[PDB]
Structures are given as structure tokens and as C-alpha cells.
CSV table of C-alpha atoms in Angstrom, one decimal:
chain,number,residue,atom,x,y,z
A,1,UNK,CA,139.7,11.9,175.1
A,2,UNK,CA,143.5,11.3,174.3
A,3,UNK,CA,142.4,9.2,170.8
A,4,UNK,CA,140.6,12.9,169.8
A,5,UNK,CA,143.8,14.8,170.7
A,6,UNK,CA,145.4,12.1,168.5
A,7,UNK,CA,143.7,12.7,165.5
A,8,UNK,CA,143.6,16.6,165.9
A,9,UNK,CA,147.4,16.2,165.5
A,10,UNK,CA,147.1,14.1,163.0
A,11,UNK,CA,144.4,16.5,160.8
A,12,UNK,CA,146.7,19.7,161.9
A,13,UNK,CA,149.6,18.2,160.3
A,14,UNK,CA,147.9,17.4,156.9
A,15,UNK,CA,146.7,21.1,156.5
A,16,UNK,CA,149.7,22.3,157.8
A,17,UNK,CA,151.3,21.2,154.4
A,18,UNK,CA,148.6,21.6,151.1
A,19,UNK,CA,151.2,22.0,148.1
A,20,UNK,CA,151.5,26.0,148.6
A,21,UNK,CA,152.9,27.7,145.6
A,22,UNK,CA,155.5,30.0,144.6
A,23,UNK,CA,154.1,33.5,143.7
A,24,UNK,CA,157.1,35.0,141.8
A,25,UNK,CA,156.3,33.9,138.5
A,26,UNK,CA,152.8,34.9,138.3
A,27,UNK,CA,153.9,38.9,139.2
A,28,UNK,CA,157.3,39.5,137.4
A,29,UNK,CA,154.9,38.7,134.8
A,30,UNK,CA,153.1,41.5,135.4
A,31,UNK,CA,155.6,43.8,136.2
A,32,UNK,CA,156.7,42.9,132.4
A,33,UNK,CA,153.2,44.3,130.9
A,34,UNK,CA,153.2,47.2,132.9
A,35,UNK,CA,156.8,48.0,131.3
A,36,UNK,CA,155.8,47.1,128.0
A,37,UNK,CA,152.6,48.8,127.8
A,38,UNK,CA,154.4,51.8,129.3
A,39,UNK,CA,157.4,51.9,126.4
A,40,UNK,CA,154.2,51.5,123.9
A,41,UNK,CA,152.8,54.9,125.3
A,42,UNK,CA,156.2,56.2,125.3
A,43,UNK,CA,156.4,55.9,121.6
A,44,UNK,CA,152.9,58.0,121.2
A,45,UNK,CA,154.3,60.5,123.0
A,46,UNK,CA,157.3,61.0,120.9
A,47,UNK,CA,155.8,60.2,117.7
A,48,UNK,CA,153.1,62.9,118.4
A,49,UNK,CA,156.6,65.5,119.6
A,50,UNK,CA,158.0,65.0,116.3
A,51,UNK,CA,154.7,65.7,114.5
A,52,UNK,CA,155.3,68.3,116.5
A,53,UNK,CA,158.1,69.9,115.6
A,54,UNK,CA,160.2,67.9,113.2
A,55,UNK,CA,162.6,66.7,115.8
A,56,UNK,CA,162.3,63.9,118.7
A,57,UNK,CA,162.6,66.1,121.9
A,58,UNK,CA,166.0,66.4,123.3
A,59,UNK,CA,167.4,63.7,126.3
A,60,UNK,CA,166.9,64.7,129.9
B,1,UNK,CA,145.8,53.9,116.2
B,2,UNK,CA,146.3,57.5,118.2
B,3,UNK,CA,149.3,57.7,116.2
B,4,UNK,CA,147.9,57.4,113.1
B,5,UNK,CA,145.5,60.4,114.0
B,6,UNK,CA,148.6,62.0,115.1
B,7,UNK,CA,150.0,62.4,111.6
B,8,UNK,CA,146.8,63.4,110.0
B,9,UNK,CA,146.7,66.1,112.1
B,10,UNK,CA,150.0,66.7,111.0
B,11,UNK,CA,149.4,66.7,107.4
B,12,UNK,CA,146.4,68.2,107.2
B,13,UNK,CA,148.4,71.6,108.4
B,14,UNK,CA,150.6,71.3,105.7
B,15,UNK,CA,148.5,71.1,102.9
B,16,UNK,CA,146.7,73.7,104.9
B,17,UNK,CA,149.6,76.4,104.2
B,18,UNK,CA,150.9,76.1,100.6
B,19,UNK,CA,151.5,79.5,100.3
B,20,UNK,CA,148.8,80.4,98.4
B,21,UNK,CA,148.9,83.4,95.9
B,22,UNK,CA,146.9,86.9,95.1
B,23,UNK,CA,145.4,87.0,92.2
B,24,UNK,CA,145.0,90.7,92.2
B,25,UNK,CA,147.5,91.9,89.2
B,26,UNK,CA,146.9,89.1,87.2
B,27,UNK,CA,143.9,90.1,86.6
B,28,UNK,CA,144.0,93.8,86.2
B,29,UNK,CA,146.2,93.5,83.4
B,30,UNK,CA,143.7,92.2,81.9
B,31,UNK,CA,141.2,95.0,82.6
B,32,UNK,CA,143.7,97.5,81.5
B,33,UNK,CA,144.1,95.3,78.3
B,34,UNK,CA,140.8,94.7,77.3
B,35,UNK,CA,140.7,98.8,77.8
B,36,UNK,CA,143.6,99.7,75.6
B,37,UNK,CA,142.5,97.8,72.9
B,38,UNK,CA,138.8,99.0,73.3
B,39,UNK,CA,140.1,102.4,73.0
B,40,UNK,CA,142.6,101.7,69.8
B,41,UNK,CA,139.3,100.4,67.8
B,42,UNK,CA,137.6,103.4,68.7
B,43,UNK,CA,140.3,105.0,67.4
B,44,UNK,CA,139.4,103.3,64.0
B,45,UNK,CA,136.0,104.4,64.4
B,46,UNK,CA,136.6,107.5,65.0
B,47,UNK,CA,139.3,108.2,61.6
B,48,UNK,CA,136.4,106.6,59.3
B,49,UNK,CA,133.7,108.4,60.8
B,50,UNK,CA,135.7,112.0,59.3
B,51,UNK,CA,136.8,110.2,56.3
B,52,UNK,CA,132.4,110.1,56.2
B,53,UNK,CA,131.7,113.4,57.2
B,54,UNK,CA,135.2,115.2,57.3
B,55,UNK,CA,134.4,115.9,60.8
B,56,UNK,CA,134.6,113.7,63.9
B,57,UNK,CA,131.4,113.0,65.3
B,58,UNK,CA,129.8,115.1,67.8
B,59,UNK,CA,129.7,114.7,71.4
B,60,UNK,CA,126.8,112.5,73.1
């Protein structure tokens, strides 16, 4: 019946619009502690060179 | 922390190699001194047993 197809258009527009977020926060995030935990390795590494050999390894 | 198990690593080589000395002459000069003056007492011995017997002892 046309009063159905009235009120399937009018439930297809509510869902159609439900508040949907912004997802760019919630991964720069973890791009930062995958940067941050990698400089924190980093500095094992070069801590353990120099135990190494009395100098921090040379750049490039 | 790895790091911290880094530099124990890296002192326990150190104290590992503290150039340590033979102790081979300092002791046979003290052989060859307790020898000398072994042999200048029985020198002693010896000169008093003549001044006894105006002889030196025999042999064995």
C-alpha cells in the first residue's frame, strides 16, 4: 500500500543519517605510538653500539 | 631495562681485563734468597766446625 511506501521513506531517511564519526583522530593517534615506541627502540640500539665500541655509529 | 643489561655486559668485560700480572720473578727471588742466605750460615757452620776439629767435616 502507498501509506507502507510512505513510511519506508520515512525509516530510510532516519538511518540514512545516525551521527557517523570522524575517524582521523582515533588513528593519527596511533600512528604517534608506533613513532614513539619505534624512537624508544632506536635508543637501545645505539646505547647497546656505543657499549659497543665507545662511539655512537656514524650517520647514514 | 635491556639497556641496563646492556652496560653490565659492558662492564663486566672491563673488570674482566685489568691486565693482570705474572707472578713468576717475584717469587723466585725469593727462592734464590732464602738459598743464599742458607748457604752463608752454613758457611758459619762450617768455619766453627774446624775451629772444633781443625778440619772441616767429612762428607755425608
Amino acid at each position: 500500500t502507498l501509506i507502507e511506501l510512505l513510511i519506508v521513506v520515512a525509516i530510510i531517511g532516519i538511518l540514512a543519517a545516525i551521527a557517523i564519526p570522524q575517524f582521523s583522530a582515533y588513528r593519527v593517534k596511533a600512528y604517534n605510538s608506533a613513532a614513539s615506541s619505534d624512537l624508544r627502540n632506536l635508543k637501545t640500539a645505539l646505547e647497546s653500539a656505543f657499549a659497543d665500541d665507545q662511539t655512537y655509529p656514524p650517520e647514514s
